[PDB]
Design a protein around this nucleic acid. Structure first.
Ligand SMILES: [K+]
Ligand SMILES: [K+]
Ligand SMILES: [K+]
Ligand SMILES: [K+]
Ligand SMILES: [K+]
Ligand SMILES: [K+]
Ligand SMILES: [K+]
Ligand SMILES: [K+]
Ligand SMILES: [K+]
Ligand SMILES: [K+]
Ligand SMILES: [K+]
Ligand SMILES: [K+]
Ligand SMILES: [K+]
Ligand SMILES: [K+]
Ligand SMILES: [K+]
Ligand SMILES: [Mg+2]
Ligand SMILES: [Mg+2]
Ligand SMILES: [Mg+2]
Ligand SMILES: [Mg+2]
Ligand SMILES: [Mg+2]
Ligand SMILES: [Mg+2]
Ligand SMILES: [Mg+2]
Ligand SMILES: [Mg+2]
Ligand SMILES: [Mg+2]
Ligand SMILES: [Mg+2]
Ligand SMILES: [Mg+2]
Ligand SMILES: [Mg+2]
Ligand SMILES: [Mg+2]
Ligand SMILES: [Mg+2]
Ligand SMILES: [Mg+2]
Ligand SMILES: [Mg+2]
Ligand SMILES: [Mg+2]
Ligand SMILES: [Mg+2]
Ligand SMILES: [Mg+2]
Ligand SMILES: [Mg+2]
Ligand SMILES: [Mg+2]
Ligand SMILES: [Mg+2]
Ligand SMILES: [Mg+2]
Ligand SMILES: [Mg+2]
Ligand SMILES: [Mg+2]
Ligand SMILES: [Mg+2]
Ligand SMILES: [Mg+2]
Ligand SMILES: [Mg+2]
Ligand SMILES: [Mg+2]
Ligand SMILES: [Mg+2]
Ligand SMILES: [Mg+2]
Ligand SMILES: [Mg+2]
Ligand SMILES: [Mg+2]
Ligand SMILES: [Mg+2]
Ligand SMILES: [Mg+2]
Ligand SMILES: [Mg+2]
Ligand SMILES: [Mg+2]
Ligand SMILES: [Mg+2]
Ligand SMILES: [Mg+2]
Ligand SMILES: [Mg+2]
Ligand SMILES: [Mg+2]
Ligand SMILES: [Mg+2]
Ligand SMILES: [Mg+2]
Ligand SMILES: [Mg+2]
Ligand SMILES: [Mg+2]
Ligand SMILES: [Mg+2]
Ligand SMILES: [Mg+2]
Lengths: 201, 64, 144, 117
RNA sequence: UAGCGGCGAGCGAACGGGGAGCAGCCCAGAGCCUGAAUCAGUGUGUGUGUUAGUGGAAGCGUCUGGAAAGGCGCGCGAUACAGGGUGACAGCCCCGUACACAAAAAUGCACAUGCUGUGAGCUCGAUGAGUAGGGCGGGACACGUGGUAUCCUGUCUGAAUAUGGGGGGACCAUCCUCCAAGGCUAAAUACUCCUGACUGACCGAUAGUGAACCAGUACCGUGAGGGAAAGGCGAAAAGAACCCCGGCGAGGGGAGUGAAAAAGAACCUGAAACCGUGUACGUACAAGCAGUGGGAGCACGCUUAGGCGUGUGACUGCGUACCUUUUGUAUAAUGGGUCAGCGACUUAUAUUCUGUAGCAAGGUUAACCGAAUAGGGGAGCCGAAGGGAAACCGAGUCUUAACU
RNA sequence: GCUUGACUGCGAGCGUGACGGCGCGAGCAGGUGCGAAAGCAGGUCAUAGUGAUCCGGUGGUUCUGAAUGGAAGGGCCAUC
């Protein structure tokens, strides 16, 4: 399988397994959901009837008052009482089998190629750490919402991309499944494609 | 936490190849003189747990 | 392929039961617990093996046997494991290095399970009659 | 993810109270009472879709009987006569003709009497 | 798991393996020798942080509007599009932010070199006694006295001390291994009254702290102690000059402000129960879960002028609420005065089954490392073989002297 | 009258039980009694005469034996 470079107009050979496989929606869905679950902080709590501030005194005697029987001022039935099943901090992260993670990335990358959302270049860089330069470069390439994957992340390109919310600049080791789907186009350097090829195999 | 085995059940049942349980027969501990040799002979080999009882045994032995 | 065009496989995500949310649900009111008794109660239900007070099965049957400490340090090797070692000599140490047996295993037996299709020297392991024939038929040898 | 119930609870209560318009006292004002009133109104309406068919047939028969007896024959003989004459006009139509076209009703009675004779 | 266990309920290791972190020393003493090692207290330069700060880019026109940050048009900054504010939603109006800088004085830290005390090196010698061990009682060990090792000791005793002694789960022999009865020692580990910054598929005034508010207050209690309710005018007070009724009232009507005053301070929105005024229709010869099916009349709309719509509902068929609990409830059994708000199958971990996805005779990693949701890490776990109490044998095995 | 089949190992198949269990059983191996032999005999005309498990005792034992040899303790078989 071959992908033509836009600037150079050569032919970078790639594996059919990585860049030409069928889209496994069910697999991709699981990995994308797991990724979003991994982002959750899970920091919260409420107070059970044990944790609400107050006395353990029985509010009124069991029998004879003509009132419903009461035991705790902290009862979840009562205003100001405990939460029946009060939350605690939770870890929402899921296991993703290594092979399912890698399988999902190969499905995603293959689908980006089929949809013409993967753009391979020989090189992508800026002269100075200047946002205006990168903004002009993306205008020249007819790019707007773009994930740029480099083999080695340039400091000038990092700093130039930082204030453009539509643009993100990654190393090949820092690819994630959600980002490949989320951005409209994915620009990869030739060197990045080889590292991703080697990573997924 | 981990389920705890009912340790008394683990001393009385062993899991077989197809997932049944073997046990030792009752009635061969004592008061043996009055029992016929035939009856005792048939109580010597291990037996399989019956269908009605498998649910009870499985509950007791989650790591069988 | 967008974040709002991904769906789970059909059948992969069944909705959980929610008890006590009205007539239409089919689990309203009693929440599938029926009427009264110990099993209807919060925290209600009898322990594992309890039979209502009748001497339970795991107490009316006798204990038997003892546990062998030697069995815990004895392993079985399949013929399919013999090729997995490095360098064509099968002994305890090479089996341990290949992650075939645990490090505390002191005794091992090769059994007729799977196939051996290469000459292997087996040294210091017991071998079954059938495994011996299979190893020797593949040009192997067995050393006590 | 705390959920407040007010907006949905209000809509549900208002839906019931709208169906209880015209009912007396708490039955058009008070949710607990209105809900019972609306369920019972539904139960009766179900029952009375069946009863309506019974009540109308009863009315048609009573009127056919009156009109037949003005023409010198009982309902029971009249119906027998029409069946023997192979007339398949149903009771709703017979009762309508009995009121609105007396002459046509007399012709049906004469047909019935001829089939019986 | 091994075990412990009225062998019940339950309790529950270690060996060994993978990791984090890593560090070793001194006295029980004389000698030779100088005070070499290094830890404390007190200095003082050198950085490096802390306690105030400084600079910090770039926008106009027009439309709607009370007001523009919104729409439309055409520009500009961006190592700054974190965030907050501004009369509606602002990269460019303001405060910031990225980035670059700053300390008279005090101070944490890290090295540096003084002074004070501390003494290393080496050879020769020494090697913790009412102790170990025992008897009795108890306790601790996963181990409940058990066949019970080991540890602690209240009580009574009581060694050998390196040609010696402890341990290896009753005990003995053999072998192996260690040296008690003196002491010190960083790191990996535990926690947050408190300080700063940042974050949240956490709450949003009956929630969230008891407490968004002058709350541990009011209030209750002799006292310990218990313990509330209660947030929102508007962009701006521009918080209503003045006039009128009234008691030089309360309250109101004007006027005026404002985009708005049914935003007027009893102030955003302003539900429901509950209480009124007005209009249409019904209702004073009529018996009951109050509706439902049928249905005239009246009123008001529409208008093929046939009818339709809306409200009401004379008269008439049928018709004993709901929940709960029960063999069975109109039941004269239970519960609810009504409304609004809140109020009950959850969460964690283990285990089994079903569905679904991955990989497949394999599958999968844990801690941890890693800036890494990646990648590393296969220690382990499950599976591919069973039979037997077990030794053991093994596609068989057990049973039995041996199987038809 | 003569005897020890009131045998040991097993058991096709079946009955009866929620289960634990209980019952009936030709036939096979070993060894036996009676009878001349065919054959019969695994107690008694049959149906009551009974007590799970734990804990422990006694005898036996090609099992186990916490460094190793033993032993203790445990297992298995018989029995209380
Ligand atoms: K960016
Ligand atoms: K159920
Ligand atoms: K504008
Ligand atoms: K702003
Ligand atoms: K002593
Ligand atoms: K020694
Ligand atoms: K409180
Ligand atoms: K409160
Ligand atoms: K009626
Ligand atoms: K009752
Ligand atoms: K009563
Ligand atoms: K489950
Ligand atoms: K599964
Ligand atoms: K067999
Ligand atoms: K025989
Ligand atoms: Mg609360
Ligand atoms: Mg991983
Ligand atoms: Mg016995
Ligand atoms: Mg149901
Ligand atoms: Mg109930
Ligand atoms: Mg009952
Ligand atoms: Mg029940
Ligand atoms: Mg309870
Ligand atoms: Mg391994
Ligand atoms: Mg909310
Ligand atoms: Mg109303
Ligand atoms: Mg500025
Ligand atoms: Mg506004
Ligand atoms: Mg010593
Ligand atoms: Mg000792
Ligand atoms: Mg002692
Ligand atoms: Mg002792
Ligand atoms: Mg003692
Ligand atoms: Mg003790
Ligand atoms: Mg014991
Ligand atoms: Mg010892
Ligand atoms: Mg001591
Ligand atoms: Mg509050
Ligand atoms: Mg509110
Ligand atoms: Mg007071
Ligand atoms: Mg305001
Ligand atoms: Mg006034
Ligand atoms: Mg407002
Ligand atoms: Mg208001
Ligand atoms: Mg009238
Ligand atoms: Mg009258
Ligand atoms: Mg009247
Ligand atoms: Mg009346
Ligand atoms: Mg009607
Ligand atoms: Mg009636
Ligand atoms: Mg009753
Ligand atoms: Mg009834
Ligand atoms: Mg009554
Ligand atoms: Mg009642
Ligand atoms: Mg009651
Ligand atoms: Mg009541
Ligand atoms: Mg096995
Ligand atoms: Mg059989
Ligand atoms: Mg006991
Ligand atoms: Mg030994
Ligand atoms: Mg030993
Ligand atoms: Mg023994």
């Amino acid at each position: 399988m071959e992908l033509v470079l836009k600037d150079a107009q050569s032919a970078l050979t790639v594996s059919e397994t990585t860049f030409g496989r069928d889209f496994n929606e069910a697999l991709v869905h699981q990995v994308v959901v797991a990724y979003a679950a991994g982002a959750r902080q899970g920091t919260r709590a409420q107070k059970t009837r044990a944790e609400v501030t107050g006395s353990g005194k029985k509010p009124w005697r069991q029998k004879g008052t003509g009132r419903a029987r009461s035991g705790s001022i902290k009862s979840p039935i009562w205003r100001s009482g405990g939460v029946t099943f009060a939350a605690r901090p939770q870890d929402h992260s899921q296991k993703v089998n290594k092979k399912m993670y890698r399988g999902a990335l190969k499905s995603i990358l293959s689908e980006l190629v089929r949809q013409d959302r993967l753009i391979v270049v020989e090189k992508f860089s800026v002269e100075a750490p200047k946002t205006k330069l990168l903004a002009q470069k993306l205008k020249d390439m007819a790019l707007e919402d773009v994930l740029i994957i480099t083999g080695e992340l340039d400091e000038n390109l990092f700093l130039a991309a930082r204030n453009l919310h539509k643009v993100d600049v990654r190393d090949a080791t820092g690819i994630d499944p959600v980002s490949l789907i989320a951005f409209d186009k994915v620009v990869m350097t030739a060197d990045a494609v080889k590292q991703v090829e080697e990573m997924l195999a | 936490p981990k389920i705890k085995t009912v340790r008394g059940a683990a001393k009385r049942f062993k899991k077989t190849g197809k997932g049944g349980f073997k046990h030792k027969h009752a009635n061969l501990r004592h008061i043996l003189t009055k029992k016929a040799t035939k009856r005792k002979r048939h109580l010597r080999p291990k037996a399989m747990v019956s269908k009605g009882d498998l649910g009870l045994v499985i509950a007791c032995l989650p790591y069988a | 392929m967008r974040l709002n065009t991904l769906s789970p496989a059909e059948g992969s995500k069944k909705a959980g039961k929610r008890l006590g949310r009205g007539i239409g649900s089919g689990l309203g009111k009693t929440g599938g617990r029926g009427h009264k008794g110990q099993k209807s109660r919060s925290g209600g239900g009898v322990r594992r093996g309890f039979e209502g007070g009748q001497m339970p099965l795991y107490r009316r049957l006798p204990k038997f046997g003892f546990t062998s400490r030697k069995a815990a340090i004895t392993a079985e090797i399949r013929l399919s494991d013999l090729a997995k070692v490095e360098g064509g000599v099968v002994d305890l140490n090479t089996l341990k290095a290949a992650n075939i047996i645990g490090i505390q295993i002191e005794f091992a037996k090769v059994i007729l399970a799977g196939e051996v299709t290469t000459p292997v020297t087996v040294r210091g392991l017991r071998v079954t009659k059938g495994a011996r024939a299979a190893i020797e038929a593949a040009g192997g040898k067995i050393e006590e | 993810a705390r959920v407040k119930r007010g907006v949905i609870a209000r809509a549900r209560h208002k839906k019931i109270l709208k169906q209880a318009k015209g009912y007396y006292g708490a039955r058009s004002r008070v949710y607990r009472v209105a809900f019972q009133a609306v369920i019972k109104a539904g139960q009766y309406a179900y029952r009375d879709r069946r009863q309506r068919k019974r009540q109308f047939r009863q009315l048609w028969i009573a009127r056919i009987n009156a009109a037949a007896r003005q023409n010198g024959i009982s309902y029971s003989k009249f119906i027998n006569g029409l069946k023997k004459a192979s007339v398949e006009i149903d009771r709703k139509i017979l009762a309508d003709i009995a009121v609105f076209d007396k002459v046509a009703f007399t012709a049906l009675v004469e047909k019935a009497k001829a089939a019986l004779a």
